[PDB]
């Protein structure tokens, strides 16, 4: 006589409710972290948004590869329960320590004098690459905030999700997980903006962004502990299926040719192609957008309030479009839904670049909407990222996870951990490498925006050419 509250069994409810509530808390922290990490490195003194091309390739990329190897080594020395804590607790300690301890000490540990000497000896083109050494502690926060979205959002959660959840519940409640975790963006974006509004209490003296950063990093710990408490509960009071595997345990002792196995497949060879094409294109657009952001919001608090507003808008757009996807998929197909994201990103990016390039003459409409050309660029790039990233979260990520179904059950576990951890940073680092070569070749990033559009078309025209290759092979493992 098991009850079926809301038509859903009360035994599965004890498994799904704390799981979507966890993914709510996980994306609540990431919304604070991924917003603060941009406020931290872009609006610092002596740094610009041109640090981002160099942050992602030389700092964020090898630390993601370094974490992959450490997490893979940690997977075969700790239990599944212990592996979750030993990955997520150091994140909680770091962000809590950064708010309360490491950020106030930044003025003591940041070599602002040695970097200003490098800036003169090496010139204006190198403000970006030198800025990594100025605010290296803020650059470490950047990679840790980047690793939260790649490990906690993707590896830690979905690894625990796909373990306790059956295939039938994963087809019914996973779409609800994204819906409830975009309410997290709406609420954490309001949280980022609320705690970014300068108190104006004690206008002189105490840093306004310091009290802002301490309040938010306190929530990151509190909402991060909620992830650990929601994890302790499902593992103690919810029956774990321990579903029987089909393969032997003999696949082991692989640390270097696991990558060779993962690249031998012409299937993962196109999954990774899509996961890099997105990330290359998104970087190519968003680094320029964030340069416009720094030009428009120079103080950390203005930038953080705008990032909170932008996070709320991203949450609402992604909620709407995750509601629309569950009709787009059924009506059209995987191949059309895999075309929507590259096309929307390409069109939004070319519209943004054709406003940075060919909008100066078309200033009449910019003034008509009561804006400056820079504010118009800021809002157009904000819409670019909102549309592209909501499109991702609602069709590309569903298309990605709807392609791992016809595989082995051990290739997928360490394959879409690999794909995430070293293909999202890999794609964004490829885009960042393009942008940083163009920075060191043409001086500023503003001189490089005509060539950003040509490269954007090349990556997208292969993004579609690789989705069709995966489509013609996602269709051929079906009737």
């Amino acid at each position: 006589a098991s009850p079926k509250i809301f038509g859903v069994e009360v035994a599965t409810l004890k498994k799904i409710i704390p799981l979507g509530l966890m993914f709510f808390c996980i994306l609540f922290n990431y919304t604070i972290l991924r917003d603060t990490k941009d406020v931290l490195v872009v609006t610092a003194k002596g740094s610009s948004a041109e640090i981002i091309p160099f942050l992602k390739t030389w700092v964020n990329l090898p630390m993601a590869i370094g974490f992959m190897l450490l997490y893979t080594k940690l997977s075969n020395v700790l239990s599944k329960k212990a592996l979750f804590y030993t990955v997520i607790v150091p994140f909680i300690i770091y962000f809590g320590a950064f708010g309360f301890v490491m950020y106030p000490l930044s003025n003591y540990i940041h070599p602002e004098a040695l970097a200003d000497k490098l800036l003169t000896t090496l010139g204006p083109r190198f403000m970006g690459p030198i800025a990594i050494l100025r605010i290296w502690s803020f650059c470490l926060f950047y990679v840790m905030a980047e690793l939260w979205g790649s490990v906690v959002v993707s590896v830690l959660f979905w690894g625990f999700a796909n373990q306790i959840t059956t295939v039938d519940e994963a087809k019914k409640f996973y779409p609800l997980f994204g819906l409830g975790a975009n309410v997290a963006l709406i609420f954490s974006g309001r949280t980022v903006k609320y705690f970014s509004n300068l108190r104006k209490n004690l206008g002189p003296g105490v840093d306004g962004w310091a009290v802002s950063l301490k309040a938010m990093m306190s929530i990151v710990v509190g909402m991060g502990l909620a992830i650990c408490l929601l994890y302790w509960w499902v593992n103690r009071y919810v029956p774990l299926p321990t579903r029987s595997k089909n393969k032997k345990e003999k696949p082991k002792m692989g640390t270097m040719e696991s990558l060779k196995f993962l690249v031998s497949s012409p299937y993962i060879r196109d999954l990774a192609t899509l996961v890099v094409a997105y990330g290359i294109s998104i970087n190519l657009v968003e680094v320029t957008w964030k340069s416009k952001l720094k030009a428009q919001f120079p103080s950390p608090n203005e930038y953080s309030a705008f990032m909170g507003d932008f996070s709320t808008c991203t949450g609402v757009a992604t909620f709407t479009m995750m509601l629309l996807s569950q009709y787009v998929f059924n009506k059209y197909g995987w191949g059309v839904a895999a075309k929507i994201t590259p096309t929307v990103l390409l069109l939004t990016g070319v519209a943004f670049f054709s406003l940075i390039l060919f909008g100066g003459p078309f200033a009449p409409l910019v003034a008509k909407l009561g804006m400056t050309p820079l504010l118009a660029a800021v809002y157009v790039g904000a819409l670019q990222n909102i549309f592209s990233k909501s499109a991702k979260y609602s069709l590309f990520d569903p298309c990605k996870e709807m392609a791992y179904i016809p595989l082995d059950e051990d290739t997928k576990v360490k394959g879409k951990a690999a794909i995430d951890v070293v293909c999202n940073p890999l794609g964004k680092s490829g885009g960042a490498l393009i942008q940083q070569f163009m920075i060191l070749s043409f001086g500023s990033l503003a001189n490089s925006t005509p060539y950003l559009g040509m490269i954007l078309l090349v990556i997208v025209t292969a993004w579609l050419a690789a989705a069709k290759s995966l489509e013609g092979q996602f269709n051929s493992l079906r009737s």
Partner: nanobody, 120 residues
Framework: EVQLVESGGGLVQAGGSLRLSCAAS????????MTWYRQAPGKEREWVAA???????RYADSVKGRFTISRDNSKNTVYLQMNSLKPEDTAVYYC??????????????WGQGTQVTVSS
């Protein structure tokens, strides 16, 4: 076609204030690395202040805290606000747009300078 014209220099008492103006033509000042130099008769040209396209400001130790370099994008002008002027600040101040990589100077455009004199 790049030109820099300086203005605002003049006589002030010790401890007074001035605002040197740099009207630039042929390039946007927000995309440029702008600097203020000063040269007094009998001494070599001395770098005073610098502003970057990112808005980052750098100052010499002798003027740090008293001088402030900024720019107006709409006017395409670079300003040097000189407060608490000492008699040792008397020099011809040059505004300069510049670009270089390590020691290869891609372009280097100067102004004709403006005289700043601090009385005693």
């Amino acid at each position: 076609e790049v030109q820099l014209v300086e203005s605002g220099g003049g006589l002030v008492q010790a401890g007074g204030s001035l605002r040197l103006s740099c009207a630039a033509s042929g390039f946007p000042v927000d995309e440029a690395y702008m600097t203020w130099y000063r040269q007094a008769p009998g001494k070599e040209r001395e770098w005073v202040a610098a502003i970057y396209s990112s808005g980052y400001t750098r100052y010499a130790d002798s003027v740090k805290g008293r001088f402030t370099i900024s720019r107006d994008n709409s006017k395409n002008t670079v300003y040097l606000q000189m407060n608490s002027l000492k008699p040792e600040d008397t020099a011809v101040y040059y505004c300069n747009v510049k670009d270089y990589v390590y020691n290869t100077y891609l372009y280097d455009y100067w102004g004709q300078g403006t005289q700043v004199t601090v009385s005693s």
